[PDB]
Amino acid sequence: APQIMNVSARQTTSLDGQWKTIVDPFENGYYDYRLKPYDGGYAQDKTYSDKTKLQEYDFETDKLLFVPGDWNTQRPQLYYYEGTVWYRKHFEYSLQPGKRLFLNFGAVNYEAIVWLNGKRLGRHIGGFTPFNFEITNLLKEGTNSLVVKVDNKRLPEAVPTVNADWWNFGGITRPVTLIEMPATYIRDYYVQLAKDDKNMIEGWVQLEGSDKEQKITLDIPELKVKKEVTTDANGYASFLIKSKPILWTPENPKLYAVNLASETDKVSDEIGFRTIRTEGIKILLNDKEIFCRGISIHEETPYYSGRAYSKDHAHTLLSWAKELGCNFVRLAHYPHNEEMVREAERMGFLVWSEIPVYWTIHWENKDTYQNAEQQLCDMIARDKNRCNIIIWSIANETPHSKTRLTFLSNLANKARSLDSVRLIGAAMEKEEVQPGVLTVNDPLGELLDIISFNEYVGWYDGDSEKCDRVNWTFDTQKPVFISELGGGALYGHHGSPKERFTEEYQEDLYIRHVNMLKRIPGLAGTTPWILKDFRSPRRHVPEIQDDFNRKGLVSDKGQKKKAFFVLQKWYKELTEAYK
Amino acid sequence: APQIMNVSARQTTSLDGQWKTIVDPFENGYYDYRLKPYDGGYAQDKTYSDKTKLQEYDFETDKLLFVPGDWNTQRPQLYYYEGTVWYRKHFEYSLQPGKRLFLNFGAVNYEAIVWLNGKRLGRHIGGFTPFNFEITNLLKEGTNSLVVKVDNKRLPEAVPTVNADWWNFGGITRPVTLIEMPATYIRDYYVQLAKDDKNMIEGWVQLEGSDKEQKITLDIPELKVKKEVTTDANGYASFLIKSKPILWTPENPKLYAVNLASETDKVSDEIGFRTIRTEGIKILLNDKEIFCRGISIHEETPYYSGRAYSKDHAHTLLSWAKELGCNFVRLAHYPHNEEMVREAERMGFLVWSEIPVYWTIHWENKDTYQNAEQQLCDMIARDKNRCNIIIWSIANETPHSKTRLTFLSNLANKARSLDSVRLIGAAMEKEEVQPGVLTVNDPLGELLDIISFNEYVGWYDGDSEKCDRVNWTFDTQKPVFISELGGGALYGHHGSPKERFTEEYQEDLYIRHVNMLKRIPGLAGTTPWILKDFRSPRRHVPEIQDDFNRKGLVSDKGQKKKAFFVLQKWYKELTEAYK
Amino acid sequence: APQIMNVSARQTTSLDGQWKTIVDPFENGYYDYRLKPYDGGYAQDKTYSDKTKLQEYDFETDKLLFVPGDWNTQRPQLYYYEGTVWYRKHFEYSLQPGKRLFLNFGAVNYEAIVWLNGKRLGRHIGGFTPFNFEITNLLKEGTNSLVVKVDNKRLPEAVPTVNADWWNFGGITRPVTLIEMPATYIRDYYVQLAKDDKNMIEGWVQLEGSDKEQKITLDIPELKVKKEVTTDANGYASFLIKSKPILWTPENPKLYAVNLASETDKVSDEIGFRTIRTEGIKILLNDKEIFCRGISIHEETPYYSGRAYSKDHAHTLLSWAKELGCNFVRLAHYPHNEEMVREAERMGFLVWSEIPVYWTIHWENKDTYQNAEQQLCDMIARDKNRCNIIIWSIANETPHSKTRLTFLSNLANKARSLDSVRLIGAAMEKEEVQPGVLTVNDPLGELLDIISFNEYVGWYDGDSEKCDRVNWTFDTQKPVFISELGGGALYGHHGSPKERFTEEYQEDLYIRHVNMLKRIPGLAGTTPWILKDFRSPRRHVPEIQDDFNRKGLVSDKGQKKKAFFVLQKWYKELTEAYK
Ligand SMILES: O=C(O)[C@H]1O[C@H](O)[C@H](O)[C@@H](O)[C@@H]1O
Ligand SMILES: O=C(O)[C@H]1O[C@H](O)[C@H](O)[C@@H](O)[C@@H]1O
Ligand SMILES: O=C(O)[C@H]1O[C@H](O)[C@H](O)[C@@H](O)[C@@H]1O
Ligand SMILES: [Cl-]
Numbered sequence A, B, C: 001a002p003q004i005m006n007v008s009a010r011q012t013t014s015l016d017g018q019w020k021t022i023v024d025p026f027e028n029g030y031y032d033y034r035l036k037p038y039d040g041g042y043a044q045d046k047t048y049s050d051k052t053k054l055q056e057y058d059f060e061t062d063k064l065l066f067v068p069g070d071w072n073t074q075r076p077q078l079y080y081y082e083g084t085v086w087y088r089k090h091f092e093y094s095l096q097p098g099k100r101l102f103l104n105f106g107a108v109n110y111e112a113i114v115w116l117n118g119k120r121l122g123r124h125i126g127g128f129t130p131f132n133f134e135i136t137n138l139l140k141e142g143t144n145s146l147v148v149k150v151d152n153k154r155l156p157e158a159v160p161t162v163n164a165d166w167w168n169f170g171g172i173t174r175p176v177t178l179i180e181m182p183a184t185y186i187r188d189y190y191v192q193l194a195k196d197d198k199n200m201i202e203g204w205v206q207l208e209g210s211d212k213e214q215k216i217t218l219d220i221p222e223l224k225v226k227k228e229v230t231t232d233a234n235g236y237a238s239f240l241i242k243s244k245p246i247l248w249t250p251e252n253p254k255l256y257a258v259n260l261a262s263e264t265d266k267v268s269d270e271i272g273f274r275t276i277r278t279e280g281i282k283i284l285l286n287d288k289e290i291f292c293r294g295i296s297i298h299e300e301t302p303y304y305s306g307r308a309y310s311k312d313h314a315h316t317l318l319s320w321a322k323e324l325g326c327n328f329v330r331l332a333h334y335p336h337n338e339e340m341v342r343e344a345e346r347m348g349f350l351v352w353s354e355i356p357v358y359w360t361i362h363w364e365n366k367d368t369y370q371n372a373e374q375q376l377c378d379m380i381a382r383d384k385n386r387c388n389i390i391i392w393s394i395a396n397e398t399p400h401s402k403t404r405l406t407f408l409s410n411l412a413n414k415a416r417s418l419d420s421v422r423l424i425g426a427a428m429e430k431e432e433v434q435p436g437v438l439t440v441n442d443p444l445g446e447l448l449d450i451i452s453f454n455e456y457v458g459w460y461d462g463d464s465e466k467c468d469r470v471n472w473t474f475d476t477q478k479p480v481f482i483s484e485l486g487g488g489a490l491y492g493h494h495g496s497p498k499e500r501f502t503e504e505y506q507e508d509l510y511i512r513h514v515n516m517l518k519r520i521p522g523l524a525g526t527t528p529w530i531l532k533d534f535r536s537p538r539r540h541v542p543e544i545q546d547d548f549n550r551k552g553l554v555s556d557k558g559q560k561k562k563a564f565f566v567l568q569k570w571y572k573e574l575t576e577a578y579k
C-alpha cells in the first residue's frame, strides 16, 4: 500500500516486455450502454475460447505494446491518442509461505485501475509517481492475470490540466516490478546530514509488519559507523550520529555504502552527504559559494523521443550535459524516473526536482489540491536521500490570483514540513515595470528561497537585440535563478542571424543573452530551455518544428547546434571563476 | 444564416477538393498559455513568409485533407483522433453588385467555428445538419481566406453524448458550396398533399429580402397546374390546389417537376405526392395497407467505410437494398446527406429519418434540449418535400425516466407542429415481463404512431433457439415496427451454426427469427440491423470484428452473407402477400 | 487446367474474405540459406502448435489481408511493396462422388504459385488473366489448406516490363472461386454472327470429360432457335443458324438469353449480335457509320483507388462515362475483370480490350513472346462472346525496331487467327515530320485496321496554343482513332488558364484540342486519357499529383473537373451529327 524506499535494492522480479492490449476509446470494457459498470468487462481477462458464447473482446489474440513505454511512439494510430488502453499480463510466481509480495508501478500516465485475477486492486492518479499494491494473499498457483486500465484523457481538474507544452504520453511508462519482502520489512528510511551541520548525520527507520519492535543497526563501513537502535511499537526509530563524511560535490560526487539491517530485513543503499543553504544572494554548497551551471531536461529519449526510463537513457542525456559543462540539471516538469536521478547523483549533477503544477491549475478545487500535495509528498518520499537534489519546485508559470497564492503557499509549507534542508523554488515570470526595466514582483517569491523565474528576452520578448539594452532589478536580496531561457533552431537549417529558427539566430541570441546574464545582479544559477528538442503538440511550423519544441541546444538526434558551444564556453569560464 | 431549401437547384459553386490543415490537439491556435482567446491565432491564416518574425504555424506548407470527408480514414494518425483540426481554403469569386452570396456546409462533425478573411462568421453544433453564412458584404476581390476550426471531442451534454455504437468521424464530412442568390430570393417552400387527401395539394412559399411582397406562380406542368399568389408583408404565401396527381409508391416512385417563380427568383424541384396514415395495426400508403420491408443503413461508404456523401455512395448502398427486396430503408442514427434521401426517393424506398437522441442523453440540460430540437427542426426543414419519408424518429434506446419522457414528448409535439402528415416514431426496447412473454411497456409509446422498437432475441438475448419459443404481446393496437434485429458474422468465416460470428450462425439466426416475426401480432414493418458492416470502437474481437460492427447482411466489401438470402426470401414472400 | 467459359454461370462457391498472410521479402518461405528450395517451407501451412520444435512462421496467428484486393492500399507498409506475400485459406467442401471441382483465380499479379494440402498445383505468370486448377481428387475430408505465393517484383523480361505509368498493385486482385462441374462438362463455346453477316449465327461447343460424344442443343428462345448437333470424338461441334436477331447497339444494347444443353451439362449466357468492319475511313457498326465517343479507363476504384473487381466498381465508373456522353470505353492497359466488360455490355459501351505489351518489352526474348501471346489468347478466349468488344489492342507506345515489328506482327496474326471479326488496334505515336505537320508513319500501322495513336499536343508537346496551329496528314485511308489525349489538373485547384495543373488550363486545353480534333481527316474515334485520376509512381509534384496521374476528367473522388463538360458538350454534338 504505502511507498517502498529504494525499490531497486530489494528482491525484485520484472514483469516488463510486451503485453496484450485493447484500445478502447469509448470505454466499452468498463461501461455498458447505460453508462453503468458491468461484471463481464475486460478486467476479467476471459480468453475467448468458447465461440458458442458471445463476447466482444479477446486479449489473447490482440496486439502487443512494449512495457515500459509511451504508447504514442509505438503505433501511428496512437500518436495523438488520448483515452483508454487496456494492458494485460500473464505471469507465475512461487512465493514461499510467509513471504510478502508487492506489485510496484514506476509510473502510469494518467489514471490507472489495476486488477489481479479479476479482482480490483485499486486506482491511481498522477502520471509521474510510483504506486504499489500488496498481492501476497491474492496470488494463485499457476497463471495469474494482471490487467491495467490506463487512461490519459486531459481533465480540467487534473494535475497537470488541459494545456501544457509537452506531449500527452500515455501508457505504462516506467517498469513494472514484483518486490518480495520478509514478513516484517524495512519500508522507509532517511539518512542525511542534519541541517547546516557537516558533523552530524541524522535519520530514521520505519518497519512494516507484525513484528515492529526490533533492534536496528545502521552500518556505514567506510565511516566506521555502526549505530544500533530499537524501534518503538509503531516500528519507528530515529538517530543522530557524530561523523565527518567526505562531502558530495559535482566535482567529487562521493557516495557512501550504507547498510541497514533489522532483525527481519536488510537493505543496502548508496547515499551522499552535503549541506545546502542560501546566504544573501549566494547559494552555498558545503559552505562554498557555487554557481548552478545548469540545463533543463524533459523525460524524453535521445533519437526516438519517447518516454525515458532506463539508465542508458539517463547516461546519454547526462553525458551531453557533462560535455556542455553543467554541474546542475533542472528535471522538468514532473518527477523523473529514479534511474535519471540516481545517474545524476553518480555523475555529479545537482538537481532541481519538480511537480506538474503547471499553468492554469484549478486553484479552487479541493480534489485538485489533494492531488498536487500527494504528488509533492510522493516526490519527496522517493528521493529524500539523494543529496544531489537541492531544490524542490512546486510550480511553473502559474497565473497570479489570491487562490493560486493560497494553493502554492500550502504546498511550500508542506514541503518545508517534510524537508527542512533543501531549497524551495518555483518557476515565476518576469514583468517590464517600466520601458527597459525588467523585474519579478510575484507575491509567490516571499515563499521561495530563491528568485527563480523563466524569461525569453530575445525570443518571445523582442529580437536578440533586446538582450543588449534591457536592465534588471530585484527588490529582495535572495539568489536569482533563471530556470528557463533560450530560443528555437532546427539543426542543419542555416541562414542569416536575423532569421528565426536558423542555427545562426539561436547562436546570436545565446551570445547576447549570455552577455546580459553577466549583468543580472544576484544571479546564482541558470538552466536554459532546453538540452534536447522534445515533442509538443503546440509547435506546428512544418519542416521546422513538426511537433517538436526546437529550443534544444542538442537536436532530438543528438547533434550539437551552434548555440551549444556558446553556453559551453560561458560555463567553462564560470567553472574557473568559481574555483 | 437561415436554411435554404433545395440547395442543389440554386446557382452553386463547389469549394471541395483538398484543403490545408493543422492538427491541434491542445487548441494552441485558439487559446494562449493562460487559456485565453488571442488575436494572432490560426484563424488569421497568415502565411509565414517573413522568417524574421516569430510564428508557430503555417497553413501554406502544411498537409492536405480531402473535403468532403471524415479525417479518420485519411491518415493512420487520425484513425482515433478526437479533437481540433484546422481547415483552410483560399478562393476567388466575382460577385456582381446587388447579388447575394451564401456559404453552405452540408455537415461538419461536431463543432465548427468559421472565419472569412480573419473575421468570425459564426459557430455551429451538431454534426449531421447543414448550416449557412451570408458572405455578400465580406467577400474581397482577389484571394479570400476561409478557415474552419473543426472539433469532434465527445461532450456529456452534446447530442449525441459520450457513448454511441458508431465511429466518431470528425471533419468537414459533406460538401461545401457557395450559393449565389438574387437580392430577394425564395428561401423556403412546401408542396405536398394535404393530410389524408389525394385530391388536394397544399403548400407555402417564403421569400427573403427587401422586396418581400411579390407575385409567385406555382407551376406543375404535367398536372396543368399554374397557381398565382402574392406574398404578404413578411414574404409569405400559402396555397391550396385541387389536383389529382399520380401518387408515389415504392413500385412507381412517380415525381413531378415543380417550378416556383417569383418576380425576383426562380427554382425548380422534383416532388411526389402520397398519403400516409395508420389504421389500427395497419400502415396505409395511399389508402393501401403495406408492409415496410426494410433494412437499416449507416451513412458509411462501401469498401473503404468512410463517411458517405455522394450520389455514387447512395446508389451503391440502395442497389444492395433493392436486391435484398426492400421497399423501405431506415437511415440511422442521424440525418443523412441529402443525396442519400434523394436517391431513395428516385429509386423507390420509403424512409425513416432520425436525429441522434441516442442512449444516455442529458435530459435535464436545457442547452441539450435546445440542441436536440434544433437538429429536429433542421432535419424536417430540409426534407419536408421528400414524399418517400413517412417516419420521423426522435430517439433510439433511451433509458426510461420522467425527465426523459418530458424531453421526448416536447420533441414529438414539435415534430407534429412542423409536419401534420408524417408518422412519429422512436426506437424503444423490449422487456421479458414473465418467462417467454416479451412486450414493450415504454410510456413513450403513447406519443408515437407506431410501436417501434429494437430487439435482439437470438444474439444478445439467448441463442438462436430462443426465437423458437418466446411469445409477444402488446397493450395497445398500433402497428408494430421492429427497427432493429439481427446478429453479427464475418464474411468468409464458416463453421457450425452454433458458433457465433460464423455465416452459418447468422443464417440460422435469421431463419428462426423470421419465423418468429410471422407470429408477432400487428407487425407492419422491419428494418434489420444492418445493411453493411460499419465502424464502431466498441467491437474488439480481433480477426473477427477489428473495430467493425459485423451485423451487416453485406460485408463492408459488398459481399452478401448467407443470411442476406434468408431475409431476401422472406421479403419476396411479403411482396406477393401484400400485392 | 484449361480456361472455363462463363465462370459466373456455373455452380460457384466463393473463397473470398480475409486470408492469413506472411510478407516475405527475401523469400525465406521458399529458399533456404543456400538459396535452394526446401520441404519445410511455408507451403506446408503447419500451424505452430508444438513449441518444443523450431519453426520460423505461423499463418494461424499472423495478419489478414482482404481477398480480392491489391495489397498496396491495405497497409501503409505495403504501399510500395514489390516482392512476395504468402496467402493462406482454410476451407471445407462436400463434393458428391463423380462431380469435379475446379479452383479459379480471376487474377493474381504477377507470379502465383499455388499449393493445396501441401501439394503444388502449379504456377502462373501474367497479372490480369484468369487461371484454373482441377482439385477433384486432391480435396480431403474436413479442413483443406490453400496456400498462394504471390510475387509482384518487376522483371525486365516480363509483360509488362520494369517501367510503366501505373501502380504496381500486387496480390490476389480478383475473386477466388470454386467451380463444380459434372463429370463431362461444357468447357468452352462461341456464339456470334458470322463475319459481316446480319443473317447468320455461327458458333461451336467444346466438351471436356470421358463422355465427349453427345447431342448438344443450342436454344435461343426469343429467336425461336433450337439447334441440335452432335459433338465429334474430341468433344467438338460447330454450327450455322439462319437467323435475324435484333442487333446490339450502344443505344439499344440488346442481349439474348442463350442456353446450351448437352446430355451431361447445361449453361446459360446473355449474348448480343452485331457486325463490325471498316470501309475507307469509316467504322461501320451494323452497316451504320459511327463515331467512337470514347474515354479511357484504368482498372481502379472510385474514391479509394485500389484494384477494381466488382459490379459496383464497374457501374460507378461506367455511369460517369454515361454522363460524359460516351458510347465507347478503352479499357487500358490490360484485360479488365469480367464484371467491367459485362457491365459495359449491358449498359451500351463499345470496348477496346488490350494486353500490357507496353513500352520497352524485350522483343528478342522468346519466353517474353510466349508470355505476350498467352495473354492475348486468354484475353480473347474469355470475352470472345462479348459483342460490345470491337477492338483488340496488342501494344501501347512501343519503340520502333525490326525485332519489335516482328514481335507485334506475330501477335496481330495470332489475333486474326483467333478472331476474324473484330478490329486489330495498337496505340502508336505521332511524329512532327516538318514544322507544324504531324503524322503517324509507324510501320506497325500496316498490320492494324485503324490508325490508332496517342498524342499530347498542348500538354507534353507545346502549350495549349499548339492545338491552334498544327496540321495533320495520313498516308493511308484507314479510320483514325486517337487512343489517348489530354492533360493533368487537380480538382479544386484554380488559377490562370496559363497555369499548368489548374482546372482552367485543362479546360482551355480541351477547348482548343476539341477544335483541333474536328479538323483531323478520317477521325472516327477518341478515348481521352483519362476518366479518373489513378495511381502512378512516376507523378511526384507534391500537393498536386501526390502519386496520382491527374489526367482524369473526374477526380479520384468522383468530382467532375471543368474539362469534363468541354468533352461532354462535344460528345453531345457528335451524338446528333451521327444520328
Ligand atoms: O514556450 C516554451 O518553449 C516553454 O515555455 C514555458 O517556459 C514552459 O515552462 C515550457 O514548458 C515550454 O516549453
Ligand atoms: O449492439 C448493436 O449492434 C446496436 O445496438 C443498438 O440497438 C443500437 O441502436 C445500434 O446503434 C447498435 O449498433
Ligand atoms: O503520360 C501519361 O499520362 C500516359 O502516357 C502514355 O500515353 C501511356 O500510354 C499512359 O499509360 C500514361 O498514363
Ligand atoms: Cl520552438
Ligand SMILES: [Cl-]
Residues within 6 Å of the ligand: B487, B488, B489, B539, B545, B548, B549, B550, B551
Ligand atoms: Cl457485431
Ligand SMILES: [Cl-]
Residues within 6 Å of the ligand: C487, C488, C489, C539, C545, C548, C549, C550, C551
Ligand atoms: Cl499528370
